[PDB]
Structure formats: structure tokens, C-alpha cells
Subunit: 145 residues, 6 copies
């Protein structure tokens, strides 16, 4: 069902995206926040390949099944902390940038909880997962069953 | 914070929705399809109260964590059988009836995998969860948070 | 043409939906509000089968042609009372729950004109017509001409 | 409350739109089609001022209450002829031009039932009502209310 | 070809009627800068390459900068536009997308801060006019010169 | 007007995004296609900061004002070659991945005009500009005004 084996067709292009990924992982952001960014953006973008991966990674790091399962419907779930909600609002707004334009309210709420350095790391992370989602959905990557 | 305790505010209205729910549960549809309908519609509708409930019920009935977790992004997931995909296409179209109008392609794909009787049961089940989602989101029902 | 004669294919399922309909009818909500709920939701949902029925029902109960004809465009019509506008805002938000998430403003406006008991009955009624619309559009039910 | 009395604020601009309206009216298009175009576009655009007007005009020319009331939901209504359906598809596509881009299928179906000359008349008529809708909604024009 | 209908040939009378409204707008007294802005922005929203091509050329002829022309597709985030131009653009966007927005109070009041009621009527008729051209040109797949 | 000077707030994160950018620039794709990808995606995403930049880069590389100005409305413009149209359909589908899910028809059309290797470079380039647009709109970056 896969369209292109992208890692084989252009190894260097793949490695360039992976370099950005490796930066994200080592950026200093709490792993919990990285998991959240990756899982939530992948849900918005319909990327089963990435959702499968990030569910597994979140579980391995001890995040609860509720935290994982409710991520698709976070706005109405009391699971998430105020800081997590601030982050999720930004993940949503920025993932859907063409629609939302990244509103003042979402940014202000994020600023209450994070430094500008952290916000840059968060936003680069959102960009990175948005790239993987585009590659994986675009090329119909198939997750393991 | 909850807006209204609807079971208290109107016991009779609550009972009426519970009667429809009771019909769906005893309708004859495979449990697996009932869980799928309820979980997928709840995700589309943004209903955390129902998603929490239906994840838990799905788990109780032995559905895998992958089947549960991937429901939000089923189109791109190889987890679901062709029959499940037919059902999911219909849950999606019918939950979003105003936008999709329930197209011939989604209906024809469903008809390939289910009898007309089953299709009526499925469609009533979709209506039922759409009602619960509207009640729960509308009244800001709060799901339990685990320890 | 009709996809499925649903009352014939599953009499028990049809009976269950009619049971809910029967509750709504006897719920004690003013019938003017039941008509409004049914007509407006059916318009939003594109359900000609139900619009045809509820137009005729509204007329039978002596609601004016303007009240009926303007329901598709109520926001800009001075026909509707403040209480009706509060109800219409809720019908719209709840019918489009996936888009709107039933906002605070719509809820508080509704609370200003209806008791909590009435609000529960209203919201169950919105659910009920949303079910009928899904069945009728879903099975391509044909209204009489 | 009305925002601007536009006829008073700029009589010249008002007259210019009225001249286009006069063209549409005497264009040769069947009055039933003119009514249909005006009523349907007005519903899409949320223009109560124009819907009120065009409901009354349609009624005056003997169109049925069903024809009038089902226009908001025409796709699922058997009241409309195949020709009317072809026209309605185009009214919808062109009224929502930014979303649809006026697709080949909608144009092909229209072409089945109308000459190129008629299509130009139709499309100018769609443009004209789209202008009135923007003026009326834009300036919050208030329709009369019958007791 | 790529064109569906040669509309000026198929109905000269209908063409003349739309041109008459266009000729009103041109003569209306609105600053030509604002006329260009209304036409260019609405055409972009509506996906009308036929009109975008024409109105880019007209704007350039009247001495509007390449930035002013090119950033019109993404004006909300561009410091190019004056506060008055932004007020107008907000209204062009809201009214062009009337079915979605309903022409909100905020957009109207902001416009009111920069234009007289008479000017607002001329502006709104102008938005109507371009919205008509866009529907004709996209509808008929009119092809701009290359 | 600016929310965050991202290069100053996190030099390390900036360097990481620049590394991906430097790959794209030297990927071997024809610069015309790189400009097209960057300009179109930026228009879709409402990013004035990137549109301003990519308009200027396209002009420097000799692309016509028509090719630049019509990108916002490409579907209806005869300026673009069939190969460019194939690419544009993919840029649009993938930029709006949540809405479109990258359909078979768009992919097959792209395949008719580009090798699998090129398609990978193209899609990475789409991801890259989508990241820049999120950063610039997200942080309200302000482009220079001439």
C-alpha cells in the first residue's frame, strides 16, 4: 500500500529530515511535551503511521492510557494540566496555521507557561512533526500491526 | 466544570435516551461494531466524556490497544478489516451528515459488507451516539480521571 | 429513489427511534419550540424529508408562513423573538457540535430564557431530530410531492 | 437595526445596482428560473432580507409552498425537475465560487438543459443576487414582519 | 479550448449590463487605489486568475508597488498596508465571504472609522461588482493573456 | 509587532531549521520548482514574511512577474506548464494534508512529471516551507518594506 520507499529513493533528503528530528529530541524540552506535540499533531493530520509510533513511545515513557487516548479530544478532557492545555492550544493553532493564523489568545496562554526559548523549540517541534506527517501520509507509509 | 446534571434536571428525558441506548445494546449487532460506532463518532464530535467511556468498554471487551488508539486516524491505518473500513466510512459520513450528505459510494461500500437490517441497526446506533455526544459536550460532562 | 425502507428492514430499530420521538412530543416543551427545533436542525442537516414534514406540521399548528420560510436564515430575520433566537443559537451550536463544541455564550444565552429542565428537554429534542435527519438522508427517504 | 440607508447615502450606487437588476428582469429568462436563482442564492448567503422578498415573489407567480420551503434543502427533495436541479447545482457552485471553483460536473449538467446564451443570463443573474445579498447583509437591511 | 463560453459573444446584452455596473464603479469617486485594492483582493479570494492578471496590471500601471501587489494574497500579516487599507481589506474579505462571516460588527465599525457612509456604499457596490466578474470569469473559464 | 526573534531566542533551533533549509536549497531540484513550492505554500499558509522573501528570490532568478503574481490563483491561470500544474496540485494537497489526505489523483499526476527521487525531494521541500511558515506566522515575523 506504500507509494514510495522514501528512505531508499532519496537517502540524503530523508537524513536531512532526521537531522531536524534528532535536534528536537535533544533540544532540552521535557519528553512529555515532545510526546504531546507529536501525538496531537499526528492526530490532527490523520497520520496513522505517526500516531501508532507516538502512542507506543508515550506508553514506553509511562504516560497513562487516558493521557494517550483522550489526546484526540483534549479540549473536553480533565486529564490535561493547565500547562499541557496551553501547549495543546498552540499545537492545534500552529498545525492548522492556514485556518487559524496563530491567534493572540493561544500565544498569550502559551507565554504564561513557557519562555521564548522553549516556545521556539516547541514550534520547531510542531514543524518537524508536520513534516513527518506530510511525508508519511503523502507516501502512504504503513505502520506495523 | 459541569453545566447541568441532566439526569437530575430531567429524569424522564434521561430515561428516554437510556431506552434508545438499551435498544442499541440489545439490537443484535456484534459488540465490536457497536464499540467502533460509539468510539469513532465520539472522536469526530470532540466528546471526551464519551471517548473515555468507550475506550474503557472497548478494552473490557478485548479490543487491542492499537484498534482503540488508531480510531482517530483510521483511514491510514492497516489495523482495520475491510468490513470495519466500510463501517467507518459510514460512521464518518453520517456523523458529518450536513457536510457529506451520505454519498452513494459510502453507502454502496457499506452494503457490500452488511445486510439492510444490519445497516438500519448501524445507522440508529450512529444516531444514538450522536445524541449522547451532543448531551455530554453540551452540558460539559466530566469523565473520571484515573489514579 | 429510496435506498432502504428502514421501517420494514428493522421494525424494532424504527420503533426505538419512534419511542424517543414520542417522549419529545409528551415532554412538556411548548410545541412552538419543538417545531422550531425540528425545522431548523433539519434545514442545517439538508434533510428534505424532515423539512417537508416539519413545515407542514408547523403550518398545521398555526405558525406563520414567514416564521417558517425564514428559518433557514434566522440570524438576519426580525421575525424571531429574543427567546426564539436564544433557542436557535443552541439548535445551531448543538447540531454542529463537532465544529462549535457548544460555546459558553450560546449556553448562557439559552440559560437566560429557559430553565435547566427545559434545556435538558431541548437538547434531547435536538438529539432526536439529528437522528431522524441521519436516517432520512442516510436512506434517501422521499417526501410526498 | 439597519446600519446604513444605502439608497439615501449613495443614490448613484443604488441606481447602478438597480440598472443591473432591470437587465436581469427583462433578460428573457423564464421568471421561475429567476425566482429560483434569487431565492436559493439568498438562502446560501444568509440574507433574510432577500429571502423574505423572494419567497413573496415566488408565491405571487404561483410557485408551490413546497417548491419555496424545500429550497434550503433541495438536493434531497423530489419536488424539483431535472432542469431545476441542474440550475440549482450551478447556483450553489457559483454562489460559493471561492470554495468550489465552479466544477466541470456542475457546468456539464447545466449545459445539458440550457443554451450558452441562457447560461450567460443565468450567471449574471447569480452575480446580481450575490451583490444584493452582500448589500443587504452588509448594511443589516430589515425585512417587514407580518402580523 | 480551455474556455467554456465566450460570454460577450454568447450574450452581448448581458455583457453590456455587467460592464455598465463596472463603468459606474470607475466613475464613482472612490480613490483608484481603493478600487484596485477591492478588485485585486476579492479576485484572489475567489480564485479568479483572469481578474487577478488584469488587476495586477492595472495596479502596476497606476504606480502601486510590487510589494503592495504581491502581498495582497497574505495582507493580514504584511506591514505594507496602511491602517485605512487594512480597514478596507477586512471589509473586502468579510463581504466577499458573506456566507461564512455574515459581515460582523467589528469589520463594519473598523471600516466606519476610515470611510464615510457614502464611501462605504460605493465600496460595497464595488465589492459586489468584482464578485460578479469573478463568478463570470471563473464560471466560464476565461483565459487571461500570457 | 514581532512576538519572538527566533534566531536570537534559540540560536540552536534556528541552526537546525537552517540545516534542513540548506539541504533543500542544494537538493538538485531545479530552482524554479523550489521557488514555486516555497511561494505557493507560503500563500496558502498566509505567511507574508515568506511570500515577500520568495517573491524577491523568484524575481532575482528571472521568473516573470506573471508567474509570481498568479501563484495565488494558479488553478485558473494558463501561465503554468503541465509539469508546474502537477507540482502545484501536490503542493496544495500536501500543504493541506489534514483536509485532503494526499489523494491518489494528485500523486499519480505528480508521478507523470517527476521521478520518485524528485518526488521525495519535493515533498521534503513542502515540509520545510510548511515549517518556516509556522515559525514566521506563529512569531509574527515582519518582512522589510521598500
Amino acid at each position: 500500500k506504500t507509494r514510495i520507499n522514501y528512505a531508499k529513493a532519496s537517502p540524503e533528503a530523508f537524513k536531512a529530515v532526521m537531522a531536524l528530528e534528532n535536534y528536537v529530541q535533544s533540544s532540552g524540552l521535557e519528553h512529555r511535551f515532545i510526546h504531546l506535540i507529536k501525538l496531537r499533531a499526528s492526530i490532527i493530520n490523520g497520520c496513522a503511521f505517526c500516531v501508532d509510533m507516538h502512542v507506543k513511545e508515550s506508553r514506553h515513557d509511562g504516560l497513562s492510557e487516558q493521557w494517550i487516548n483522550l489526546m484526540s479530544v483534549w479540549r473536553e478532557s480533565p486529564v490535561y494540566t493547565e500547562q499541557e492545555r496551553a501547549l495543546l492550544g498552540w499545537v492545534d493553532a500552529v498545525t492548522k496555521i492556514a485556518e487559524t493564523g496563530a491567534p493572540d489568545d493561544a500565544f498569550e496562554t502559551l507565554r504564561a507557561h513557557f519562555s521564548d526559548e522553549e516556545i521556539v523549540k516547541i514550534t520547531v517541534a510542531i514543524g518537524a512533526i508536520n513534516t513527518w506527517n506530510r511525508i508519511a501520509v503523502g507516501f502512504r507509509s504503513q505502520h506495523p500491526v
